[model samples]
Target: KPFIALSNGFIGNGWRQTMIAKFEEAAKQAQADGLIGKYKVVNAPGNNSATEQVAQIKSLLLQKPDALLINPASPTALQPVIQQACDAGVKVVVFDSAIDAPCAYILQNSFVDWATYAAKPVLESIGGKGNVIVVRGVVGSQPEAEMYETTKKILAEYPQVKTVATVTGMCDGATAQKAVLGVLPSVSTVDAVIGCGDGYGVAQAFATAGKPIPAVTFETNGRALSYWKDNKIDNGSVAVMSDPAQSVAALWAALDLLEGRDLPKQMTFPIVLIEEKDRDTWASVLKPDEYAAWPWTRELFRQQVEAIKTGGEPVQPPIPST
Candidate 1:
């Protein structure tokens, strides 16, 4: 059996924490089933540091694992190091974000789809003719920039949808709440708040301002979903985010590559999306800090790859039974 190792770029938020949790859980199962040997998981200190991740990977290379799975901090910065991994006869699987290194396989979620799904429903829920607050994600990131572009494109299609204020939420619940609160006093009659997985905090900001909560996009975690379900705030809200389960998917991708299975150099995974209809089911199954994740089996992964190859709809993997 091939030894596998995972290197996480950062572990600051609940989403990152749960991604590691899911990976560890799945890795243990695979080990028990005699699918793999001893595995290792390492995290680079600080929020995000390409320098630290580079050092971490260099150290992991010493362990001589058959495969290395990375959630990169800086896509291009890790290029040289990943190329080295390939030269060392180790298969490299990069997930969550895209890396420019041609030697490593890239598996990531789509930011354009995340932005479109977050904004369009909130905009249409308000009938597309009212003022909206745009809570942006971590500023200057490739994902944030791409998402912002998609958002602006969608907003252009809705002529009457006015943006009263744009706040940088940093894609965190607490930060989003504070940023929205700071602008709420100046902006009047917010019909909706579209954000990158910070809708729950946006709702709290509205409640704090003693204003009516408008339609808002939410984080896919249980905390936000429970709030949305318990409050029954139907104002055209939805929960959407890049799935944390990509780590598990990456693990499987690594195994497949090591087992001589052919896969594309680049693959895109589906984002986790929760609408009103499935709100209760997710809320009940998820813990307060848990993000909703799809259970990725090897067969399901192949199905996703097939869909991507055919330019067909991505597979909707089942929610976790536990």
Candidate 2:
């Protein structure tokens, strides 16, 4: 009969909604099995309000949930309120985007590693050189900064390749397509497009613009994978940015803490890859509008989590080596 509260800052697209659904499904299962008291969800009004998010969580706190899953609106802005929850005996698991609070368990992907993983093949396909377009996420957010900075480092390794333009995709498909359309004609001969987070949408920009889609990175968005398969995006690499799935992991971690089970204070995942050969398989499983996901069992994922905290081998999704 443990209650859990979820604080989400964004609900803008398929990925965010899919993440929320994971928690909802897990809570339903837990309740059906007679293990949960209640589970509640609250999103920051306006979708980007750190103040509103804080207030909502502070209000949720008064309900005294045993666990709180937080996807923050701002990396630093949610720190104080999140700490307040921890100080109040609420088990905190911050996923998707992290908070500055040390009391929370941080379950996240290595954006630098993932971004570089996606960036590498795209760069290499072009023989380590050419003019490229870089698509980024929310301008100053942690994921945005981490991915883009790592992308720059990756690009630096292939010195001749230069950024012809940078577009703020805002991590939305239609929005990214429009941003890409705006910058398409400004530069000619784009050798590749490195997506910061939303790879498929970034690549789709070229498709919609009546331009030949160049070597690009594909995040495991179902529609994107479908697009890749349909178009045979030969030079693009496929990967999943499963922040939403991570929230489900957080729910389990919070439950562990609630049940007096040990949980790691912080951990990350291997670069989640949906190999180019397996694109059709995953695309078929996930619908055109769905985010790619499999049964993310806590027990199944625990090995991956523990491996990050310890020096051990991985049992989760594996990344293909360069």
Candidate 3:
């Protein structure tokens, strides 16, 4: 019954909340399964700072837990601390944002994969052509850069798709609305808009004066789904991809590591696509109590721990899409 340490780098963003929720659930599951004698949870608000994340790691290391789970704010800046954790023989698992150096395991949702899944629905909605404006998240963040590069690469593969404008929303809903309004007048036809994250996409749509254009984006939590439902009620269109399933996978990974299992160096959870047409079915999947349920329950987490310990294939849930 070794103590496991869990550290979070940031907690402001929607996706960050999903990660935190999953981590807490895993801790609960570990305790329920009798895998850990004790648990130590540490937090550094980060206010989104690589320096703060590094300091948090140093402080957590001083407690000397058997394993460490980190969601790095800045991959490069936190490399040294991560290395030290490994050097100290502490099992390390990185979630959400990853570090350059190796660790026992890395678990996250693949931004590129989800972005690619989001593209097709958007393209179909726009009839495969027209000006598309991309609203980005925090500048230079891993998800932002990854989405930009993947969208660019995918657009190249589709000849009809053309990017008219790309703007940094800075992950702010109000900022995204303002940015979209500034560009709306100059652009004659905005066939579609792709937002790096959730609320921003809807915010951008609200900024437009004329008919709302088709929007394809990613988001986590029930509030975002409610936004899509509202859009459907008003406009008959809503296309979204979410990473909640990834949150479940990440929790399972953490639980496995806590049980002294050999986890994969990297594990990616599949993204789910939600479209207006499939809202009914998707809504059914997320029941009131289910929503309250953290991505993984104690039983499922114990199963994953046993699977990892026995060299069994990693268990994964089905990726739902419209």
Candidate 4:
């Protein structure tokens, strides 16, 4: 059977590009392995726009492909469209951001779990108590809202740690710098500034006028690791969660549905914690060629999905690629 994958867009940020690359790589590998007769991939141009993504989905559906893999623009906005696809018997798999409506499968990189992991180290670095400023991403985004909620809950456990302020950086370095500068007058007494993304966290360090306090955040890209090496930020740690993993997993799940194989309703990838001490070790592990290796190959994902369908938990071993 033929398969089709529709990407929301490559414009959200670097992370979105990473996800699209993974899906395309997985499609190539799956075709080479003779798992699917053909694979068609379409990418919309808008930056996280629900309307543009919805139009792309409609266009792909007209092609009458066997299945669809989606990274929705907005959880609530895409619900009805996804439901229509499901009603038409088009196997659907949602990844990264979730939709409120049901589908064949839903997969995400356990953001809350990793956010807690990222936060614990920060709290520990500050001796479990300090004034912290939170630099958030796009307001109302799943990651931004979820991380903020979880962080607030976690902070309650440590009463000494007060959140001085919360600023929305919209996941841009320049915007994040401005937001941090706006809060600079109150920066001296602020012990740390935690951000939703690596770029925002790095921007916070650049925007600060005085001594940099230890900060913790997620999304450890190459540039963020470089900043840590130069000792520009204190206790600068990152969450090594792969966007590619979600893409591969979603694509494979869609393939299983097309093949009439039983598959799981959900799959989640584990996250890795990277700190200054282990930065070199982590960097050494990710070789140039291995960096190109998609996190979840189609065959492996199919087997795991089948296992989940058989009332068994999906086996997610540590990623050997990085």
Estimated TM-score for each candidate: 0.91, 0.90, 0.77, 0.82
Tens-place lDDT digits, model 4, residues 255-295: 66776776556666544556456566555555321222235
| Reference-based lDDT, each prediction | 0.86, 0.75, 0.61, 0.64
Per-residue CA lDDT of model 2 for 1-322, tens digit only, reads 8989999886765677787887899888878888787999897655356788889998999999999998877878888888899899999988866456899888776777677677888888889888888887655457667788888888889989989998876666766677878898888878887774466676667777778778766657677887777877677454646455777777777887888877677667544567767777776677577666545676767777677668687556532221
- lDDT: which is higher, 2 or 4? 2
Model 1 regions more than 4 Å off: 138-141, 310-313
* lDDT per residue (tens digit) for residues 49-131 in model 3: 67877887888888887778776666577778888999998877776654576755776666777677666566676677787
In model 2, which runs have C-alpha deviations exceeding 4 angstroms? 45-47, 305-310, 317-322
lDDT of 1 at 174: 84
Candidate 3 Cα errors over 4 Å, as ranges: 37-47, 170-175, 199-213, 218-220, 231-248, 275-278, 281-294, 297-322
lDDT for model 3, on a 0 to 1 scale?
A: 0.61
How do all the candidates rank in terms of lDDT, highest first?
Answer: 1, 2, 4, 3
What residue pairs are clashing in model 3? none
lDDT of model number 4 = 0.64
RMSD of 1: 2.2
Highest lDDT among the candidates is held by which one?
1
Deviation (Å) of 52 in candidate 1: 2.4
Prediction 1 TM-score vs. true: 0.91
Mark the 10 consecutive residues where model 3 has the least summed lDDT.
287-296
lDDT of 1 by residue, 233-273 (tens): 77888888898999999988999999898889999999887
In model 3, what lDDT does residue 118 have?
63
lDDT of 2: 0.75
